[PDB]
């Protein structure tokens, strides 16, 4: 149509205007003002622990804010809560559906969420009054599979789904408080900022978006990648973030310059990134890959400075503890390992 | 101190003795993925046996779980990776459709050549043959104009069909089966096999076919432990 034609023309005109503004705001590369600092040398970690007890591949894993308790979700239908110091299993929740793809820990330590192909994020209470661990809630209302759940507090939770929409739920009531639309592909990962006012989300349309939780609108959009985005993580200060995609490339985007700062890639890498995470200082960027290995990148110099090669199958999840002391890694060979 | 640590060890031992009972049940079950072309006849097959529907059945004291994705989108390059440990993908193809047959062929080619589905075998059910017989005897619906090598194709010598069918039906069925088997014999890495069959809504032998095919899959899986 002619209306559709002029709408697409105006959209392209605004796109060109935004690109012009970005190129105007780009004066010096991050790799140009960082060449004066010294490199991190060589980072070589050792496998301190190895948690066994899962039957099938492990999709999710999330540290607790006490930096001691850990949760893992495997495809046999199990949600296991481990004590990471002494290796003892603290809980083992059996799930109603075997296809759990995500799991989360409450920042208070009282609840645990998990969702999957059943389009529901179930909330389990770990502190029942003289009872066992039983399901507290089942947040339903998504149309596609549930890719990520994240707690805001004991009463709010933000979820990503395979129907290209994110949602914000009030656990007490049980209905979607807010719905974040705009993506054109399945939303794969979401990341909360240090303060809980904003959060980023990556989808299968090779784009990432920044949402404000309270208003519910999209602030910024970042389109540096060229394939499906699998992993996303905020910088420790909340002014930048990092993504991993299937084009075998990680990217560090800025929230204030509104464009991509750094690219972490190597020609010898032809596998996609499944998970990314930052250390406590933000100088290290850990990235798990499909070639069964994990690579540590110098987030400022963009040069790889270590490898974590201990898993036999695809590295599915990867998480740094909230105090920066250990790194948990879960793979499709049904083993979580702690590195330090 | 020591009291909390011994309580934690008690809890861990109880959790582990429960996980053993759960592991013994997880190993006696064989999970199957029913992945039809959509409105292709998989509904009849699941009639014979939320976001995902599940059907449990039992053959000769062996337990089978069959999963079918429900409320999902038509894009399946992300939630299909969850089914790489499934022992078999049951792939239903509406053989009467011919362009849905090329769509099913492209789907089968993408599943066969996927990086994570490269060790998973496929039991292929070429359903809806009654309408195919109707259309090939009527001569109003053509396979020639959608598969230009239907002519020039001579029916193979093996696999004598049932005598109650018109030889043209046999020619069409074996043409489609060879169309799938060419992709299946595309060579390369994978360690997986295709077990094609000819079914209908009248059959009641399908669960035993799946049973025997899973038996052969498990046999070939065991046979790999005797190598390197």
């Amino acid at each position, epitope marked *: 149509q002619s209306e559709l034609d002029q709408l*697409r023309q105006e959209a392209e005109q605004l*796109k060109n205007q935004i690109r012009d503004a970005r190129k105007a705001c780009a004066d010096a590369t991050l790799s140009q003002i960082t060449n004066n600092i010294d490199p991190v040398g060589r980072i070589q970690m050792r496998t301190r622990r190895t948690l066994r007890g899962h039957l099938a591949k492990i999709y999710a894993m999330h540290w607790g804010t006490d930096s001691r308790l850990l949760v893992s979700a495997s495809q046999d239908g199990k949600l296991i809560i481990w004590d990471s110091y002494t290796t003892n299993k603290v809980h083992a929740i059996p799930l109603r559906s075997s296809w759990v793809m995500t799991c989360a820990y409450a920042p208070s330590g009282n609840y645990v969420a998990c969702g999957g192909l059943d389009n529901i994020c179930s909330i389990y209470n770990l502190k029942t009054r003289e009872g066992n661990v039983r399901v507290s809630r089942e947040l339903a209302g998504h149309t596609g599979y549930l890719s990520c759940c994240r707690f805001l507090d004991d009463n709010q939770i933000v979820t990503s789904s395979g129907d*290209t929409t994110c949602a914000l739920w009030d656990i007490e009531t049980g209905q979607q408080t807010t719905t974040f639309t705009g993506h*054109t*592909g399945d939303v794969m990962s979401l990341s909360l900022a240090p303060d809980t006012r904003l959060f980023v989300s990556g989808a*299968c*349309d*090779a784009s990432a978006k920044l949402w404000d939780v309270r208003e519910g609108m999209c602030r910024q959009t970042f*389109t540096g990648h*060229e*394939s*499906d985005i699998n992993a996303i993580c905020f910088f420790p200060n909340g002014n930048a973030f990092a993504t991993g995609s*299937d*084009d*075998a490339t990680c990217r560090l985007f800025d929230l204030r310059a509104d464009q991509e700062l750094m690219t972490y890639s190597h020609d010898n890498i*032809i596998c*996609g990134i499944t998970s990314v995470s930052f250390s406590k200082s933000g100088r290290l960027l850990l990235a798990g890959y499909d070639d069964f290995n994990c690579n540590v990148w110098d987030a400022l110099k963009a040069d790889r400075a270590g490898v974590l090669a201990g898993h036999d199958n695809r590295v599915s999840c990867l998480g740094v503890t909230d105090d920066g002391m250990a790194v948990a890694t879960g793979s499709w060979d049904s083993f979580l390992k702690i590195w330090n | 101190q020591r009291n909390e640590e011994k309580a934690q060890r008690e809890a861990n031992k109880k959790i582990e003795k429960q996980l053993q009972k759960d592991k013994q049940v997880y190993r006696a079950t064989h999970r199957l993925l029913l992945l039809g072309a959509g409105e292709s006849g998989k509904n009849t097959i699941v009639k014979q046996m939320s976001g995902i529907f599940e059907t449990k059945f039992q053959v000769d004291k062996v337990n089978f779980h069959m999963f079918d994705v429900g409320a999902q*989108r*038509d*894009e*399946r*390059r992300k939630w*299909i990776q969850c089914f790489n440990d499934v022992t078999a993908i049951i792939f239903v193809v509406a053989s009467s459709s011919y*362009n849905r047959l*090329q*769509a099913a062929l*492209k789907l089968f*080619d*993408s*599943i066969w*050549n*996927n*990086k994570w589905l490269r060790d998973t075998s496929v039991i292929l059910f070429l359903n809806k043959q009654d309408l195919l017989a109707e259309k090939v005897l009527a001569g109003k619906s053509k396979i020639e*104009d*959608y*598969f*230009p090598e239907f002519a020039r194709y001579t029916t193979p010598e093996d696999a004598t069909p049932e005598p109650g069918e018109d030889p043209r039906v046999t020619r069409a069925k074996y043409f489609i089966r060879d169309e799938f088997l060419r992709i299946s014999t595309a060579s390369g890495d994978g360690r997986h096999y295709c077990y094609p069959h000819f079914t209908c809504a009248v059959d009641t032998e399908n669960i035993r076919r799946v049973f025997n095919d899973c038996r052969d899959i498990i046999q070939r899986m065991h046979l790999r432990q005797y190598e390197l």
Partner: nanobody, 128 residues
């Protein structure tokens, strides 16, 4: 951004010839297997043809084999489809699609209703 701009369409008498072009930007064109798909009026999306990374492996659907020919220039990042002896049932909207992952031999959802790495397509009309 990942941009795929198709051109070359138009109205042509039955038996005529066309050459559709597809210009790509925002990705390494030589790492991806490319597809030509089409949507007919009142019908869904249909897979027409595809070509691999180097260009050695080429495939067409049944109803176009012998008439159309696909090709790719990795030096200029362009995908060409030459259509010969068109028929009245070739009138459709043609899309230039890229399948999502590089270096793979499988392209899953190029024919899905909402697919991100497609184009807007050109209308090819066959009439007299």
């Amino acid at each position: 951004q990942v941009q795929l701009q198709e051109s070359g369409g138009g109205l042509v008498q039955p038996g005529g010839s066309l050459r559709l072009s597809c210009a790509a930007s925002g990705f390494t064109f030589s790492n991806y297997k490319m597809n030509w798909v089409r949507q007919a009026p009142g019908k869904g999306l249909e897979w027409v043809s595809d070509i691999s990374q180097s260009g050695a492996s080429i495939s067409y659907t049944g109803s176009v084999k012998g008439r159309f020919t696909i090709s790719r220039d990795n030096a200029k990042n362009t995908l060409y489809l030459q259509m010969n002896s068109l028929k009245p049932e070739d009138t459709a909207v043609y899309y230039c699609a890229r399948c999502p992952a590089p270096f793979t031999r499988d392209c899953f959802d190029v024919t899905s209703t909402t697919y991100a790495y497609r184009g807007q397509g050109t209308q090819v009309t066959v009439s007299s």
